[PDB]
Design a protein around this nucleic acid. Structure first.
Length: 159
DNA sequence: CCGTGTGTGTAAAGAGTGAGGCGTATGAGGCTGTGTCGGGGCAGAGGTACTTACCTGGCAGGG
């Protein structure tokens, strides 16, 4: 069913997860990203033909769309708003801490986040199929420290 | 040249107060009634200069 909200940013109405996955899979059949294959002059012609077919334009139109819409390092200058605050934070930290080395608690949550993403199965027979509906549940750690009533710790699992 | 002895980041506890919203409880209002008791008037004992008049002390005689 629909994931329709129940509250503005805290809840939604109870919905069947299977029907939700089915709706997503149906509305993405044959025109969806459900391939799960990593990215790789002859192919340019095929791409132009596909663009022409999908957008109802000529081959020359597809070629010029491809050409014009083409894709278009630390120090900065010529500031903007957010680049301004970034540069200021960086210079402040420069007059600040002498050991730039990344904190051991940021690296922890980072590595836990990217522990095993982008690691394909070595069997390739149990690999999940398309539309497998990952639910990112987070289990609340039990209250085993006083500080765990205040800010409720939790561990996230990709069920 | 590899031991070790001290520093440092930065969010993680550890308290340490403090704050805010919400939900339940309370109240106030006539109403009407009935026992009662402090109460609150209620009056009540009960305790500036000059002049004239009057009083006092004294010494005097009298008997």
């Amino acid at each position: 069913n629909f994931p329709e909200y129940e509250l503005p940013e805290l809840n939604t109405r109870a919905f069947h997860v299977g029907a939700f996955g089915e709706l997503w899979r149906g509305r993405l059949r044959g025109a969806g990203d459900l391939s799960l294959r990593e990215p790789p002059a002859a192919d340019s012609d095929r791409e132009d033909a596909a663009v022409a077919r999908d957008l109802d334009c000529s081959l020359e139109a597809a070629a010029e769309l491809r050409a014009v819409c083409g894709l278009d390092v630390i120090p900065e200058n010529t500031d903007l708003v957010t680049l301004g605050v970034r540069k200021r934070f960086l210079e402040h930290r420069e007059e600040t801490i002498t050991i730039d080395r990344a904190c051991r608690q940021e690296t922890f949550v980072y590595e836990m986040e990217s522990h095993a993403i982008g690691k394909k199965p070595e069997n390739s027979a149990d690999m999940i199929e398309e539309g497998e509906l990952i639910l990112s549940v987070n289990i609340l750690y039990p209250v085993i420290f006083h500080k765990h009533k205040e800010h409720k710790p939790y561990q996230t699992m990709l069920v």
